[PDB]
Design an enzyme around this catalytic site. Structure first.
Site, PDB file in Angstrom:
ATOM      1  N   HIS A  78       9.122 -32.155  34.096  1.00 33.92           N
ATOM      2  CA  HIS A  78       8.568 -31.008  34.813  1.00 33.92           C
ATOM      3  C   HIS A  78       9.075 -31.024  36.254  1.00 33.92           C
ATOM      4  CE1 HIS A  78       5.640 -28.127  36.461  1.00 33.92           C
ATOM      5  NE2 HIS A  78       5.563 -27.686  35.218  1.00 33.92           N
ATOM      6  N   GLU A  94      12.104 -23.744  32.784  1.00 34.25           N
ATOM      7  CA  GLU A  94      11.288 -23.293  33.907  1.00 34.25           C
ATOM      8  C   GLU A  94      12.131 -23.239  35.173  1.00 34.25           C
ATOM      9  OE1 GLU A  94       7.694 -25.915  34.028  1.00 34.25           O
ATOM     10  OE2 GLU A  94       6.735 -24.138  33.180  1.00 34.25           O
TER      11      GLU A  94
HETATM   12 BR   LIG Z   1       3.980 -25.073  34.166  1.00 31.02          BR
END
Ligand SMILES: [Br-]
Ligand SMILES: [K+]
Ligand SMILES: [K+]
Ligand code: NA
Lengths: 245, 245
Positions: free
Chosen positions: A93, A163
Protein backbone atom coordinates in the site's frame (compact mmCIF):
# COMPACT_ATOMS: atom_id res chain seq x y z
CA UNK A 1 -15.60 -14.96 -15.21
CA UNK A 2 -13.78 -12.64 -12.80
CA UNK A 3 -15.78 -12.26 -9.59
CA UNK A 4 -16.33 -8.64 -8.57
CA UNK A 5 -14.03 -7.84 -5.62
CA UNK A 6 -14.55 -5.05 -3.07
CA UNK A 7 -12.02 -4.38 -0.32
CA UNK A 8 -12.54 -2.03 2.62
CA UNK A 9 -9.32 -0.53 3.94
CA UNK A 10 -10.24 1.04 7.27
CA UNK A 11 -6.61 2.14 7.71
CA UNK A 12 -5.80 3.56 11.17
CA UNK A 13 -9.38 4.47 12.07
CA UNK A 14 -12.04 3.51 14.59
CA UNK A 15 -12.46 1.78 17.92
CA UNK A 16 -14.45 -1.29 18.96
CA UNK A 17 -17.62 0.77 19.28
CA UNK A 18 -17.53 2.67 15.97
CA UNK A 19 -16.14 -0.29 14.03
CA UNK A 20 -18.85 -2.44 15.59
CA UNK A 21 -21.36 -0.05 14.02
CA UNK A 22 -19.75 -0.45 10.59
CA UNK A 23 -19.83 -4.21 10.98
CA UNK A 24 -23.44 -4.12 12.15
CA UNK A 25 -24.28 -2.18 8.99
CA UNK A 26 -22.48 -4.67 6.74
CA UNK A 27 -24.06 -7.72 8.37
CA UNK A 28 -27.53 -6.19 8.07
CA UNK A 29 -26.88 -5.26 4.44
CA UNK A 30 -26.87 -8.94 3.40
CA UNK A 31 -24.24 -8.56 0.67
CA UNK A 32 -24.88 -10.11 -2.77
CA UNK A 33 -23.23 -13.48 -3.41
CA UNK A 34 -21.49 -12.43 -6.63
CA UNK A 35 -19.13 -9.93 -5.06
CA UNK A 36 -16.26 -10.92 -2.80
CA UNK A 37 -16.22 -8.57 0.19
CA UNK A 38 -13.13 -8.03 2.34
CA UNK A 39 -12.61 -5.72 5.32
CA UNK A 40 -9.14 -4.71 6.52
CA UNK A 41 -9.34 -3.40 10.09
CA UNK A 42 -6.55 -1.87 12.17
CA UNK A 43 -4.17 -4.63 13.25
CA UNK A 44 -5.33 -4.51 16.85
CA UNK A 45 -8.88 -5.28 15.69
CA UNK A 46 -8.30 -8.18 13.28
CA UNK A 47 -9.57 -10.73 15.80
CA UNK A 48 -12.43 -8.46 16.89
CA UNK A 49 -13.63 -7.79 13.35
CA UNK A 50 -13.59 -11.50 12.46
CA UNK A 51 -15.74 -12.30 15.50
CA UNK A 52 -18.43 -9.70 14.76
CA UNK A 53 -18.45 -9.81 10.96
CA UNK A 54 -20.81 -12.10 9.03
CA UNK A 55 -18.91 -15.20 7.86
CA UNK A 56 -19.58 -14.41 4.24
CA UNK A 57 -17.31 -11.43 4.59
CA UNK A 58 -13.58 -11.96 4.77
CA UNK A 59 -11.12 -10.11 6.99
CA UNK A 60 -7.73 -8.84 5.83
CA UNK A 61 -4.61 -7.64 7.60
CA UNK A 62 -3.36 -4.21 6.54
CA UNK A 63 0.29 -5.34 6.54
CA UNK A 64 2.58 -8.13 7.72
CA UNK A 65 6.26 -9.10 7.84
CA UNK A 66 8.20 -11.77 5.94
CA UNK A 67 8.83 -14.51 8.51
CA UNK A 68 6.58 -16.65 10.68
CA UNK A 69 8.18 -15.63 13.99
CA UNK A 70 11.17 -13.51 14.98
CA UNK A 71 12.80 -10.62 16.80
CA UNK A 72 10.77 -7.90 15.11
CA UNK A 73 9.05 -5.77 17.72
CA UNK A 74 5.91 -4.15 16.33
CA UNK A 75 5.36 -6.60 13.46
CA UNK A 76 2.95 -9.48 12.86
CA UNK A 77 3.24 -12.54 10.60
CA UNK A 78 0.89 -14.31 8.17
CA UNK A 79 0.67 -17.11 10.74
CA UNK A 80 -0.80 -14.76 13.33
CA UNK A 81 -3.16 -13.34 10.73
CA UNK A 82 -4.60 -16.76 9.85
CA UNK A 83 -4.65 -17.61 13.56
CA UNK A 84 -7.03 -14.66 14.01
CA UNK A 85 -9.34 -16.02 11.32
CA UNK A 86 -8.30 -13.58 8.60
CA UNK A 87 -7.61 -14.84 5.07
CA UNK A 88 -6.10 -11.81 3.28
CA UNK A 89 -3.23 -9.38 3.69
CA UNK A 90 -2.75 -6.00 2.02
CA UNK A 91 0.84 -5.49 0.88
CA UNK A 92 2.60 -2.62 -0.88
CA UNK A 93 0.00 0.00 0.00
CA UNK A 94 1.26 3.48 -0.94
CA UNK A 95 1.35 4.49 2.72
CA UNK A 96 3.70 1.60 3.54
CA UNK A 97 5.87 2.44 0.53
CA UNK A 98 5.96 6.22 0.70
CA UNK A 99 5.52 7.06 4.40
CA UNK A 100 7.26 4.09 6.03
CA UNK A 101 9.72 3.42 3.23
CA UNK A 102 9.05 -0.22 2.39
CA UNK A 103 11.14 -1.17 -0.65
CA UNK A 104 9.93 -3.22 -3.60
CA UNK A 105 12.31 -6.00 -2.55
CA UNK A 106 10.83 -6.19 0.94
CA UNK A 107 7.31 -6.15 -0.49
CA UNK A 108 8.23 -9.03 -2.79
CA UNK A 109 9.57 -11.01 0.16
CA UNK A 110 6.36 -10.36 2.11
CA UNK A 111 4.26 -11.51 -0.86
CA UNK A 112 6.25 -14.75 -1.17
CA UNK A 113 5.98 -15.54 2.55
CA UNK A 114 2.29 -14.68 2.83
CA UNK A 115 1.38 -16.95 -0.08
CA UNK A 116 3.67 -19.69 1.22
CA UNK A 117 1.75 -19.57 4.51
CA UNK A 118 -1.57 -19.95 2.71
CA UNK A 119 -2.70 -16.34 3.01
CA UNK A 120 -4.46 -14.36 0.28
CA UNK A 121 -2.64 -11.23 -0.91
CA UNK A 122 -4.04 -7.90 -2.06
CA UNK A 123 -0.95 -6.50 -3.81
CA UNK A 124 -0.88 -2.72 -4.35
CA UNK A 125 0.90 -0.77 -7.07
CA UNK A 126 0.66 2.76 -8.46
CA UNK A 127 2.59 5.79 -9.71
CA UNK A 128 3.28 9.07 -7.92
CA UNK A 129 1.99 12.39 -9.26
CA UNK A 130 5.42 13.38 -10.57
CA UNK A 131 5.66 10.02 -12.36
CA UNK A 132 2.21 10.45 -13.92
CA UNK A 133 3.10 13.94 -15.15
CA UNK A 134 6.43 12.72 -16.55
CA UNK A 135 4.51 10.20 -18.67
CA UNK A 136 6.04 7.09 -17.09
CA UNK A 137 3.00 5.63 -15.32
CA UNK A 138 3.36 2.44 -17.35
CA UNK A 139 7.06 1.95 -16.61
CA UNK A 140 6.49 2.38 -12.87
CA UNK A 141 3.57 -0.02 -12.39
CA UNK A 142 5.11 -2.60 -14.73
CA UNK A 143 8.22 -2.69 -12.55
CA UNK A 144 6.21 -2.87 -9.33
CA UNK A 145 4.13 -5.67 -10.83
CA UNK A 146 7.28 -7.48 -11.95
CA UNK A 147 8.60 -7.73 -8.38
CA UNK A 148 5.24 -9.02 -7.17
CA UNK A 149 4.87 -11.51 -10.03
CA UNK A 150 8.37 -12.89 -9.47
CA UNK A 151 7.15 -13.84 -5.97
CA UNK A 152 3.81 -15.39 -6.92
CA UNK A 153 3.64 -19.15 -7.50
CA UNK A 154 -0.17 -19.22 -7.53
CA UNK A 155 -2.34 -16.34 -8.71
CA UNK A 156 -5.62 -17.84 -7.51
CA UNK A 157 -4.85 -16.24 -4.14
CA UNK A 158 -3.78 -12.86 -5.51
CA UNK A 159 -5.65 -9.67 -6.39
CA UNK A 160 -3.88 -6.71 -7.99
CA UNK A 161 -4.77 -3.25 -6.66
CA UNK A 162 -3.88 -0.30 -8.86
CA UNK A 163 -3.98 2.79 -6.64
CA UNK A 164 -2.46 5.89 -8.20
CA UNK A 165 -0.82 7.68 -5.29
CA UNK A 166 -2.18 11.08 -6.36
CA UNK A 167 -5.69 9.64 -5.91
CA UNK A 168 -5.21 8.10 -2.44
CA UNK A 169 -6.84 10.24 0.26
CA UNK A 170 -6.76 13.29 -2.02
CA UNK A 171 -10.33 13.25 -3.32
CA UNK A 172 -8.95 13.17 -6.86
CA UNK A 173 -10.55 9.98 -8.20
CA UNK A 174 -9.10 8.59 -11.42
CA UNK A 175 -11.52 8.95 -14.31
CA UNK A 176 -12.92 5.71 -15.83
CA UNK A 177 -10.64 6.10 -18.87
CA UNK A 178 -7.56 6.67 -16.71
CA UNK A 179 -8.25 3.53 -14.68
CA UNK A 180 -9.31 1.43 -17.68
CA UNK A 181 -6.15 2.51 -19.52
CA UNK A 182 -3.84 1.18 -16.79
CA UNK A 183 -5.88 -1.95 -16.02
CA UNK A 184 -5.82 -2.81 -19.74
CA UNK A 185 -2.02 -2.52 -19.85
CA UNK A 186 -1.50 -4.46 -16.63
CA UNK A 187 -3.65 -7.33 -17.89
CA UNK A 188 -1.65 -7.22 -21.11
CA UNK A 189 1.51 -7.43 -19.04
CA UNK A 190 0.23 -10.52 -17.24
CA UNK A 191 -0.59 -12.19 -20.55
CA UNK A 192 2.86 -11.46 -21.96
CA UNK A 193 5.00 -12.16 -18.89
CA UNK A 194 3.02 -14.82 -16.99
CA UNK A 195 0.23 -16.51 -18.97
CA UNK A 196 -3.03 -15.95 -20.82
CA UNK A 197 -4.83 -17.92 -18.10
CA UNK A 198 -3.47 -15.67 -15.34
CA UNK A 199 -4.34 -12.58 -17.38
CA UNK A 200 -7.98 -13.62 -17.82
CA UNK A 201 -8.64 -14.82 -14.26
CA UNK A 202 -6.74 -12.31 -12.11
CA UNK A 203 -8.82 -9.55 -10.54
CA UNK A 204 -7.36 -6.08 -11.02
CA UNK A 205 -9.11 -3.63 -8.72
CA UNK A 206 -8.88 0.16 -8.63
CA UNK A 207 -8.38 2.30 -5.54
CA UNK A 208 -8.00 6.01 -4.89
CA UNK A 209 -10.86 8.20 -3.73
CA UNK A 210 -13.45 5.59 -4.70
CA UNK A 211 -16.92 6.75 -3.64
CA UNK A 212 -20.56 5.76 -4.00
CA UNK A 213 -20.83 8.46 -6.67
CA UNK A 214 -17.89 7.21 -8.78
CA UNK A 215 -18.06 3.41 -8.39
CA UNK A 216 -20.78 2.69 -10.99
CA UNK A 217 -18.91 4.18 -13.94
CA UNK A 218 -15.56 2.75 -12.85
CA UNK A 219 -17.05 -0.72 -12.39
CA UNK A 220 -18.52 -0.74 -15.90
CA UNK A 221 -15.02 -0.63 -17.40
CA UNK A 222 -14.24 -4.14 -18.68
CA UNK A 223 -10.79 -4.38 -17.05
CA UNK A 224 -11.80 -2.92 -13.68
CA UNK A 225 -12.78 -5.91 -11.57
CA UNK A 226 -13.56 -4.12 -8.33
CA UNK A 227 -12.25 -1.69 -5.74
CA UNK A 228 -9.98 -1.10 -2.78
CA UNK A 229 -11.79 1.55 -0.74
CA UNK A 230 -10.28 3.71 2.00
CA UNK A 231 -12.25 6.72 3.19
CA UNK A 232 -15.63 5.55 1.92
CA UNK A 233 -15.26 2.14 3.61
CA UNK A 234 -15.82 3.96 6.91
CA UNK A 235 -19.18 5.28 5.68
CA UNK A 236 -22.63 3.82 4.88
CA UNK A 237 -21.99 4.26 1.14
CA UNK A 238 -19.52 1.36 1.24
CA UNK A 239 -22.64 -0.80 0.88
CA UNK A 240 -23.48 1.07 -2.33
CA UNK A 241 -19.95 0.39 -3.63
CA UNK A 242 -20.38 -3.32 -2.92
CA UNK A 243 -23.57 -3.12 -5.01
CA UNK A 244 -21.94 -1.19 -7.86
CA UNK A 245 -22.61 -4.14 -10.19
CA UNK B 1 10.99 3.04 42.76
CA UNK B 2 8.80 -0.01 42.24
CA UNK B 3 10.66 -2.85 40.54
CA UNK B 4 9.47 -3.12 36.93
CA UNK B 5 9.69 -6.21 34.71
CA UNK B 6 8.51 -6.03 31.13
CA UNK B 7 8.18 -9.00 28.79
CA UNK B 8 8.62 -8.21 25.11
CA UNK B 9 7.24 -11.19 23.20
CA UNK B 10 8.25 -9.49 19.94
CA UNK B 11 6.83 -11.22 16.84
CA UNK B 12 6.22 -14.60 18.47
CA UNK B 13 3.39 -16.93 19.37
CA UNK B 14 -0.13 -17.97 18.46
CA UNK B 15 -3.30 -18.10 20.58
CA UNK B 16 -2.45 -21.64 21.66
CA UNK B 17 1.15 -21.11 22.76
CA UNK B 18 0.46 -17.66 24.21
CA UNK B 19 -2.63 -18.97 25.99
CA UNK B 20 -0.43 -21.60 27.62
CA UNK B 21 2.19 -19.00 28.56
CA UNK B 22 -0.55 -16.74 29.93
CA UNK B 23 -1.88 -19.69 31.93
CA UNK B 24 1.51 -19.97 33.60
CA UNK B 25 1.66 -16.24 34.36
CA UNK B 26 -1.83 -16.18 35.88
CA UNK B 27 -0.98 -19.19 38.05
CA UNK B 28 2.26 -17.53 39.15
CA UNK B 29 2.44 -15.69 42.46
CA UNK B 30 3.46 -12.30 41.11
CA UNK B 31 5.24 -10.42 43.92
CA UNK B 32 3.44 -7.30 45.17
CA UNK B 33 6.57 -5.13 45.00
CA UNK B 34 7.01 -5.89 41.29
CA UNK B 35 5.14 -4.27 38.40
CA UNK B 36 4.80 -6.82 35.59
CA UNK B 37 3.96 -5.83 32.01
CA UNK B 38 3.58 -8.08 28.94
CA UNK B 39 3.92 -6.86 25.35
CA UNK B 40 2.24 -9.23 22.88
CA UNK B 41 2.22 -9.02 19.07
CA UNK B 42 -0.22 -6.32 17.97
CA UNK B 43 -2.78 -8.82 16.67
CA UNK B 44 -2.95 -10.31 20.17
CA UNK B 45 -3.20 -7.22 22.39
CA UNK B 46 -6.94 -7.76 22.84
CA UNK B 47 -6.54 -11.53 23.20
CA UNK B 48 -3.77 -11.15 25.80
CA UNK B 49 -5.63 -8.59 27.94
CA UNK B 50 -8.78 -10.74 27.94
CA UNK B 51 -6.87 -13.80 29.19
CA UNK B 52 -4.32 -12.18 31.52
CA UNK B 53 -5.14 -11.57 35.18
CA UNK B 54 -5.44 -7.86 36.09
CA UNK B 55 -2.28 -8.18 38.20
CA UNK B 56 -0.34 -8.12 34.91
CA UNK B 57 -0.60 -5.09 32.61
CA UNK B 58 -0.54 -5.30 28.82
CA UNK B 59 1.57 -3.15 26.48
CA UNK B 60 1.61 -2.51 22.75
CA UNK B 61 4.98 -3.05 21.04
CA UNK B 62 4.57 0.18 19.05
CA UNK B 63 2.10 2.84 17.97
CA UNK B 64 1.82 5.88 15.69
CA UNK B 65 1.65 9.59 16.53
CA UNK B 66 -1.96 10.54 15.66
CA UNK B 67 -5.31 9.32 16.99
CA UNK B 68 -6.79 8.34 13.61
CA UNK B 69 -5.54 8.69 10.06
CA UNK B 70 -4.64 7.36 6.63
CA UNK B 71 -1.81 5.17 7.90
CA UNK B 72 -2.39 1.62 6.70
CA UNK B 73 -0.73 -0.92 9.01
CA UNK B 74 -0.45 1.36 12.05
CA UNK B 75 -2.37 1.68 15.32
CA UNK B 76 -2.93 4.60 17.70
CA UNK B 77 -2.74 4.93 21.50
CA UNK B 78 -6.53 5.23 21.57
CA UNK B 79 -6.90 1.77 20.05
CA UNK B 80 -4.32 0.46 22.50
CA UNK B 81 -6.34 1.80 25.47
CA UNK B 82 -9.56 0.67 23.83
CA UNK B 83 -8.25 -2.90 23.98
CA UNK B 84 -7.47 -2.49 27.69
CA UNK B 85 -3.71 -2.08 27.35
CA UNK B 86 -2.11 0.52 29.61
CA UNK B 87 1.40 0.74 28.16
CA UNK B 88 3.21 1.08 24.85
CA UNK B 89 6.83 0.29 23.99
CA UNK B 90 8.40 3.05 21.90
CA UNK B 91 11.83 3.47 20.37
CA UNK B 92 12.83 -0.20 20.66
CA UNK B 93 16.18 -0.96 19.00
CA UNK B 94 14.43 -3.00 16.30
CA UNK B 95 12.10 -0.11 15.40
CA UNK B 96 15.11 2.22 15.18
CA UNK B 97 17.59 -0.03 13.40
CA UNK B 98 15.49 -2.39 11.25
CA UNK B 99 12.55 -0.11 10.39
CA UNK B 100 14.42 3.19 10.49
CA UNK B 101 12.34 5.06 13.07
CA UNK B 102 13.96 8.41 13.84
CA UNK B 103 14.31 10.11 17.21
CA UNK B 104 12.05 12.90 15.96
CA UNK B 105 9.19 10.51 15.16
CA UNK B 106 9.75 8.59 18.39
CA UNK B 107 9.46 11.80 20.40
CA UNK B 108 6.17 12.59 18.69
CA UNK B 109 4.85 9.11 19.51
CA UNK B 110 5.76 9.59 23.17
CA UNK B 111 4.00 12.96 23.31
CA UNK B 112 0.79 11.53 21.90
CA UNK B 113 0.82 8.27 23.86
CA UNK B 114 1.25 10.12 27.15
CA UNK B 115 -1.43 12.72 26.38
CA UNK B 116 -3.78 9.85 25.57
CA UNK B 117 -3.16 8.44 29.05
CA UNK B 118 -0.85 5.53 28.29
CA UNK B 119 2.30 4.67 30.15
CA UNK B 120 5.40 4.64 27.97
CA UNK B 121 8.34 2.28 28.01
CA UNK B 122 10.79 4.56 26.21
CA UNK B 123 13.77 2.66 24.82
CA UNK B 124 17.24 4.12 24.25
CA UNK B 125 20.70 2.77 23.53
CA UNK B 126 23.85 3.21 21.45
CA UNK B 127 25.24 0.89 18.81
CA UNK B 128 28.67 -0.71 18.60
CA UNK B 129 30.18 1.96 16.33
CA UNK B 130 28.92 4.66 18.70
CA UNK B 131 30.28 2.75 21.71
CA UNK B 132 33.70 2.14 20.17
CA UNK B 133 33.80 5.77 19.04
CA UNK B 134 33.49 6.75 22.71
CA UNK B 135 30.22 8.66 22.30
CA UNK B 136 27.92 6.51 24.45
CA UNK B 137 26.95 9.49 26.62
CA UNK B 138 26.43 11.87 23.71
CA UNK B 139 24.11 9.37 21.99
CA UNK B 140 21.98 8.21 24.93
CA UNK B 141 21.68 11.74 26.34
CA UNK B 142 20.44 13.00 22.97
CA UNK B 143 17.91 10.17 22.69
CA UNK B 144 16.83 10.93 26.26
CA UNK B 145 16.61 14.65 25.46
CA UNK B 146 14.24 14.05 22.53
CA UNK B 147 12.04 12.01 24.85
CA UNK B 148 12.28 14.73 27.51
CA UNK B 149 11.25 17.36 24.97
CA UNK B 150 7.96 15.45 24.72
CA UNK B 151 7.30 14.66 28.39
CA UNK B 152 5.50 16.95 30.84
CA UNK B 153 4.58 14.32 33.42
CA UNK B 154 7.29 11.71 33.99
CA UNK B 155 4.96 9.71 36.24
CA UNK B 156 3.89 7.39 33.43
CA UNK B 157 7.36 7.02 31.91
CA UNK B 158 9.87 4.21 32.24
CA UNK B 159 13.29 4.45 30.60
CA UNK B 160 14.68 1.25 29.12
CA UNK B 161 18.40 1.17 28.31
CA UNK B 162 19.25 -1.31 25.55
CA UNK B 163 22.97 -2.08 25.17
CA UNK B 164 22.60 -2.59 21.40
CA UNK B 165 26.40 -2.60 21.19
CA UNK B 166 26.34 -5.95 23.03
CA UNK B 167 23.93 -7.70 20.67
CA UNK B 168 25.77 -10.29 18.56
CA UNK B 169 29.02 -8.34 18.88
CA UNK B 170 30.92 -10.51 21.35
CA UNK B 171 31.33 -7.51 23.63
CA UNK B 172 31.09 -8.16 27.36
CA UNK B 173 28.25 -6.32 29.07
CA UNK B 174 28.63 -6.73 32.83
CA UNK B 175 26.26 -5.72 35.64
CA UNK B 176 28.83 -3.07 36.54
CA UNK B 177 28.65 -1.64 33.02
CA UNK B 178 24.85 -1.54 33.21
CA UNK B 179 25.07 0.34 36.50
CA UNK B 180 27.58 2.72 34.91
CA UNK B 181 25.10 3.79 32.23
CA UNK B 182 22.01 3.82 34.45
CA UNK B 183 23.86 6.05 36.92
CA UNK B 184 24.64 8.56 34.17
CA UNK B 185 21.06 8.49 32.89
CA UNK B 186 19.66 9.25 36.34
CA UNK B 187 22.26 11.98 36.64
CA UNK B 188 20.86 13.47 33.44
CA UNK B 189 17.28 13.42 34.75
CA UNK B 190 18.41 15.12 37.97
CA UNK B 191 20.09 18.02 36.18
CA UNK B 192 17.64 18.39 33.30
CA UNK B 193 14.29 17.62 34.93
CA UNK B 194 14.24 17.52 38.73
CA UNK B 195 15.52 15.69 41.79
CA UNK B 196 12.11 14.11 42.32
CA UNK B 197 11.85 12.77 38.75
CA UNK B 198 15.37 11.34 38.93
CA UNK B 199 14.48 9.57 42.17
CA UNK B 200 11.07 8.27 41.05
CA UNK B 201 11.78 7.30 37.42
CA UNK B 202 12.38 3.61 36.76
CA UNK B 203 15.38 2.96 34.55
CA UNK B 204 15.27 -0.66 33.41
CA UNK B 205 17.94 -2.77 31.73
CA UNK B 206 17.14 -4.06 28.25
CA UNK B 207 20.23 -6.21 27.75
CA UNK B 208 20.64 -9.96 28.20
CA UNK B 209 19.02 -11.20 31.42
CA UNK B 210 18.28 -14.75 32.57
CA UNK B 211 17.12 -16.52 35.71
CA UNK B 212 20.73 -17.16 36.67
CA UNK B 213 21.89 -13.55 36.21
CA UNK B 214 18.84 -11.36 36.92
CA UNK B 215 19.54 -11.09 40.67
CA UNK B 216 23.07 -9.68 40.33
CA UNK B 217 21.78 -7.15 37.80
CA UNK B 218 18.82 -6.20 39.98
CA UNK B 219 21.14 -5.54 42.93
CA UNK B 220 22.67 -2.61 41.06
CA UNK B 221 21.34 0.53 42.80
CA UNK B 222 20.29 2.36 39.60
CA UNK B 223 18.90 -0.69 37.76
CA UNK B 224 15.15 -0.72 38.49
CA UNK B 225 14.14 -3.76 36.48
CA UNK B 226 14.22 -5.30 33.02
CA UNK B 227 12.81 -5.37 29.53
CA UNK B 228 13.06 -9.07 28.75
CA UNK B 229 13.36 -10.55 25.27
CA UNK B 230 13.12 -14.23 24.36
CA UNK B 231 12.98 -15.47 27.94
CA UNK B 232 9.66 -13.62 28.26
CA UNK B 233 8.08 -16.44 26.24
CA UNK B 234 9.16 -19.04 28.82
CA UNK B 235 8.42 -19.91 32.47
CA UNK B 236 11.90 -18.49 33.15
CA UNK B 237 10.22 -15.09 32.91
CA UNK B 238 8.74 -15.79 36.36
CA UNK B 239 12.23 -16.29 37.78
CA UNK B 240 13.13 -12.87 36.43
CA UNK B 241 9.97 -11.47 37.93
CA UNK B 242 11.17 -12.92 41.20
CA UNK B 243 14.57 -11.34 40.94
CA UNK B 244 14.16 -9.22 44.02
CA UNK B 245 12.59 -11.85 46.15
BR1 LIG C 1 -7.14 2.38 0.18
K1 LIG D 1 -15.78 -4.41 -15.00
K1 LIG E 1 18.01 -2.04 42.14
NA1 NA F 1 -7.97 -11.02 39.85
Amino acid sequence: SRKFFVGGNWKMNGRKQSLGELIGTLNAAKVPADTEVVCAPPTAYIDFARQKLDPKIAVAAQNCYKVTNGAFTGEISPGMIKDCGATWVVLGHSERRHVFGESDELIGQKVAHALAEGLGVIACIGEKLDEREAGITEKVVFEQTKVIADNVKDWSKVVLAYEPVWAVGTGKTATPQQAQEVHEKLRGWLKSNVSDAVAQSTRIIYGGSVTGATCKELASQPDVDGFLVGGASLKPEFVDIINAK
